[PDB]
Amino acid sequence: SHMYYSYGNYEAFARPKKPENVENKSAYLIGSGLASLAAACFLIRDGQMEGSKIHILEELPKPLKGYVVRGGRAMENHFECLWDLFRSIPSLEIDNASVLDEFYWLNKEDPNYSRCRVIEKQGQRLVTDGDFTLTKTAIKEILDLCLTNEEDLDDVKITDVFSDDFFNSNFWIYWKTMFAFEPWHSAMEMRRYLMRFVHHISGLADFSALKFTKYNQYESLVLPMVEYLKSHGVQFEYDVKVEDIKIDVTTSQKIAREILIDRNGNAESIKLTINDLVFVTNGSITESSTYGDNDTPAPPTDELGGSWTLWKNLARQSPEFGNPDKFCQNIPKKSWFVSATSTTNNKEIIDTIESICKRDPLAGKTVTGGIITINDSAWQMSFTINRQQQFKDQPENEISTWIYALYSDVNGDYIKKPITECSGNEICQEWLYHLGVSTDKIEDLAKHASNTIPVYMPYITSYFMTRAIGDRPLVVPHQSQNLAFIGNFAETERDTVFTTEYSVRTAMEAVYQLLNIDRGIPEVINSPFDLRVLMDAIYELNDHQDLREITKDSKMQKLALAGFLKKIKGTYIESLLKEHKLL
Amino acid sequence: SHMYYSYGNYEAFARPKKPENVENKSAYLIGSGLASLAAACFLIRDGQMEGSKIHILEELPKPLKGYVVRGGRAMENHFECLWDLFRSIPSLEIDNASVLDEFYWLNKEDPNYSRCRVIEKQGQRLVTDGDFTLTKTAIKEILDLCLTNEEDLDDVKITDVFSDDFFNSNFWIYWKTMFAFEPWHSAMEMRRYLMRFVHHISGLADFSALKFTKYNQYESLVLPMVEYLKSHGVQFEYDVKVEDIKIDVTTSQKIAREILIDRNGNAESIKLTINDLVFVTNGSITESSTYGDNDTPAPPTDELGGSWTLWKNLARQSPEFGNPDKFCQNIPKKSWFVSATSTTNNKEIIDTIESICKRDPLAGKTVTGGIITINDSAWQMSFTINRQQQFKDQPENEISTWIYALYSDVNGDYIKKPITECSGNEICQEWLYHLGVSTDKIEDLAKHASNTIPVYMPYITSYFMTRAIGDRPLVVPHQSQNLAFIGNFAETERDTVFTTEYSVRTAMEAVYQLLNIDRGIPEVINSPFDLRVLMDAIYELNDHQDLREITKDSKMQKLALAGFLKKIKGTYIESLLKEHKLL
Numbered sequence A, B: 001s002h003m004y005y006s007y008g009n010y011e012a013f014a015r016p017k018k019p020e021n022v023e024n025k026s027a028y029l030i031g032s033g034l035a036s037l038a039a040a041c042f043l044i045r046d047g048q049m050e051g052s053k054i055h056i057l058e059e060l061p062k063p064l065k066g067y068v069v070r071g072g073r074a075m076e077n078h079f080e081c082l083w084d085l086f087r088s089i090p091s092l093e094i095d096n097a098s099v100l101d102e103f104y105w106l107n108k109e110d111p112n113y114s115r116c117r118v119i120e121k122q123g124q125r126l127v128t129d130g131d132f133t134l135t136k137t138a139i140k141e142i143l144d145l146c147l148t149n150e151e152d153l154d155d156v157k158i159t160d161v162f163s164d165d166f167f168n169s170n171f172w173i174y175w176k177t178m179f180a181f182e183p184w185h186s187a188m189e190m191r192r193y194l195m196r197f198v199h200h201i202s203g204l205a206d207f208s209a210l211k212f213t214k215y216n217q218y219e220s221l222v223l224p225m226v227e228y229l230k231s232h233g234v235q236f237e238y239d240v241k242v243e244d245i246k247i248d249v250t251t252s253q254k255i256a257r258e259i260l261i262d263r264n265g266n267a268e269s270i271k272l273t274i275n276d277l278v279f280v281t282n283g284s285i286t287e288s289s290t291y292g293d294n295d296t297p298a299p300p301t302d303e304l305g306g307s308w309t310l311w312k313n314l315a316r317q318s319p320e321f322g323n324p325d326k327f328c329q330n331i332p333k334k335s336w337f338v339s340a341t342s343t344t345n346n347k348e349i350i351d352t353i354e355s356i357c358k359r360d361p362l363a364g365k366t367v368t369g370g371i372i373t374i375n376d377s378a379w380q381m382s383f384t385i386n387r388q389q390q391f392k393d394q395p396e397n398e399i400s401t402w403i404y405a406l407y408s409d410v411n412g413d414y415i416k417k418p419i420t421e422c423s424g425n426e427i428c429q430e431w432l433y434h435l436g437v438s439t440d441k442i443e444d445l446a447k448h449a450s451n452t453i454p455v456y457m458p459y460i461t462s463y464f465m466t467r468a469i470g471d472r473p474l475v476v477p478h479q480s481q482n483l484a485f486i487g488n489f490a491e492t493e494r495d496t497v498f499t500t501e502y503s504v505r506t507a508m509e510a511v512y513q514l515l516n517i518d519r520g521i522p523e524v525i526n527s528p529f530d531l532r533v534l535m536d537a538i539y540e541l542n543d544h545q546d547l548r549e550i551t552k553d554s555k556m557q558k559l560a561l562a563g564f565l566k567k568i569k570g571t572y573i574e575s576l577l578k579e580h581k582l583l
């Protein structure tokens, strides 16, 4: 009621009037991740809140044994809120240009695509690569899922809605690895993904729809925002651990009253009035991460960190604040936990990568174009090499490779141990084996020619845990006066979590609602409602067959189609179907 | 091939790289209407062409007996190209705001809607006002038209595709008068309108979808653009009549070589190279306009002016440059020709208007909210009163009313003459009669208390003449190197003419194509392909009935619906249909 959804250029280009009474308001942002930063940016730009009244509370202060590549997930053109934000953030690389400009021009200069998406048998390209290999049964299961109401998917697993045909498809290889879905994850979220990205189905196998920043996410997204916020006087408070927020939850209002913090070791409290807004990033996929090195595994852990402890403390004050235990408890021990960043200047390794991905990793352009999946790896390992180098101060003869394994409790094929028990050099050895490197060189090249840093992340799969409506708090809970939840464990319609777009969307919706900003929020792109996109999807999903080939081997369908074509012959519907290759 | 269509914020907010070799190029814009001005703006902003190399050639120089209101057509939110343009044009009314900002804020401060759309019997509101009164037969004719391929509508009249039920509907009253469609006009263009604006069907009767500038179009749109262009050094050349452009049309290229002009009376020629771009606004609805006064009719005329003569001279050089005679010849003598602007400070007239439209005309906010149609007027007359005053220097106790008649060859009900034979005061008398003013006061109030300026426009209905594909030139004809056609007689996909959006779209497409600008053009809004919008349309078109009421009185349908509901029961399709009130 305190916001509305829109689309089109009118609302995109319009500027909101200064919101009412904002001169008497303040904001506290809990956490320093992308959602907090984006919310602060919207407070400055569209709330016209004074930067000095904006307080970002970060647990970290103002030494790892090598380079580590973080989230690094791709974006797409229809990250509608994220581009609304980053058109206003100055680039740190190009004069008089925004982050969006630099990104837009870069991905036109050097457009992303994969020349080798799946390998097997120690370095062979998969033979059916490029094809979805979906049977009619699997396709009907996909569409049956989209045709299920989200409300009917409470706690439903991906394995509850798909059968053997689907799980044997190339589609499932592409899908599970690029998005990091496990079979026991949320069918509700998988449905959101299917609908959310249907306009890019023709780019699923070759990653032609992916777009990437010039450098790692921190240098290309976080640092530009931080510079923008600091230039506007926003206050960054470091070594602040937020332990609880006392919230009054009455029959008529929800009002945050006090932030209980541990500053640099000392218990303190921030008293809030109704004009002091609090933005909580509830939960975190990176909390309690541990780090290994070339010779040491990352020590597994089950610690609840400060992020999960805080959400638990808020949930104790109202069921409307969500159910953190659905996301941070009972995570299967087979789940993805470990990622590794393997850095080398060794020509044997780099030349091996070149022979598989067909591009020079040191040229400074696209290399793998996104992850390469090792389809027959016991770990279900994938790895990617982005445009090199991904760190501004890294030597120009080095590459850094990011590696992850979807299965954490199964022996590797060359290193006969679960990934959670492997040092950096052992992870690199298993990877080199699957590249086809000669087995008499693997040990030396991993131990002495590379430096590999593993990271153990207990909650990295947490976004996708099976959930019920109500497990995630509304961005602005009902009757909340000065409290919002942002980030990928907050609830909003149809958008997909594990994306930076979701972080920016929740940030924008929280700020606009709490300040009653008179401007539209862009809806999640309308592609699942667009007949043209749905026609393309049928054509692509059936691996480029028209309606006659699709129905050929079924009399019942073969006849319903002939009756359909009779009615639409010579009409606009027939020309549309022909334009989208269905006729 | 030299442009691409896009939608969403990514392409909206992105800035194009400077196009290649633009530093060696020039532009000549023929005419000073909105399309020429918009093209010049895009040349500056996105072509990064130097303003000194941009030459606008206007026939007019750098005295009417009263105020005259011109085009004054409304806009809507999904004028996608127009808002792309006017976000970059500084407002002349508000500091540090664009034209878009001022427009956006104004129409939120004072949103448009009609409190009385149709009157009859000398000032009575129409009883069924607000309802479409469409029969099932008429609705199927509407959808059958949309389901016809545009290519099958060559030279087809509106009367060729609709029957008595449709022409007796309130829908047709609303539609024909707000858009100025005549029964003999283009069914192809009517189809484009139905598809183009389907997202606003719920605002058709009460004009809630309409948005208006603060002042008349010249003060609120043209003058801001002119100031922008002059501030960038763009050259305005006045008293230049362009008589012909010599174009080389070879087997491989189309190249404009020479502009033949009459400057201030003297024959001259502008020599063009391939790097000199020429933008022709072919044809004009305002050419050869004549003016009357309170005591004199506007003299009818059939003169081809300079605009139509120029298009004819170009068409003689290639059929690819269009067929002007389809639009400027054989216009029926019943067509709309006359509009009048009636200005008064008289309290009897203003109070009469207040009693019909329910708002104070002098308050400075919406008055009629768009045209009021006099349904039983022999002339088929409508009139509107915008926010007053529409001219910045007009006295604050005056209103100006705009009046037009769809039928030009039929005696009025009070003044027993065709409108083409009427003085300004006689047009005002016929109007006052239909307002219900007492017949013993009409003559005095028209002659002495009002000043009414009639305008005769031979080509005002020209955009809508029946046409065939090929009658309008492509914005950039095939193989054209330096020549483009812009404005509402140029050809582009799915957009609707007689709109300022069409002028800006053709301008943008011409500039982007001729300069090969590397940025997307926003497509015509995708509403006819959006299932949600199509569901709303069925609900509104059937005057707010669900699928069971719609089908109730037909056994055949009543059964196909029961079979449909059986298949979709409990699915996402059913929830969608319920959300859009069809179930």
Ligand SMILES: CCCCCCCC/C=C\CCCCCCCC(=O)O
Binding pocket: A074, A075, A076, A077, A142, A143, A146, A147, A193, A194, A195, A197, A198, A199, A200, A201, A203, A204, A209, A210, A528, A537
């Ligand atoms: C009713 C709707 C039917 C939906 C059909 C479902 C098919 C979805 C197809 C897969 C989308 C592939 C997405 C790959 C693009 C990369 C994602 C990204 O941009 O981040």
Ligand SMILES: CCCCCCCC/C=C\CCCCCCCC(=O)O
Binding pocket: B074, B075, B076, B077, B142, B143, B146, B147, B193, B194, B195, B197, B198, B199, B200, B201, B203, B204, B209, B210, B528, B537
């Ligand atoms: C296949 C598509 C079916 C199309 C259904 C057609 C019904 C169209 C309904 C009328 C649209 C009314 C437009 C009124 C809004 C004002 C126009 C404007 O904004 O300038």
Ligand SMILES: [K+]
Binding pocket: A006, A011, A012, A013, A519, A520, A521, A522
């Ligand atoms: K917006």
Ligand SMILES: [K+]
Binding pocket: B006, B011, B012, B013, B519, B520, B521, B522
């Ligand atoms: K654009």
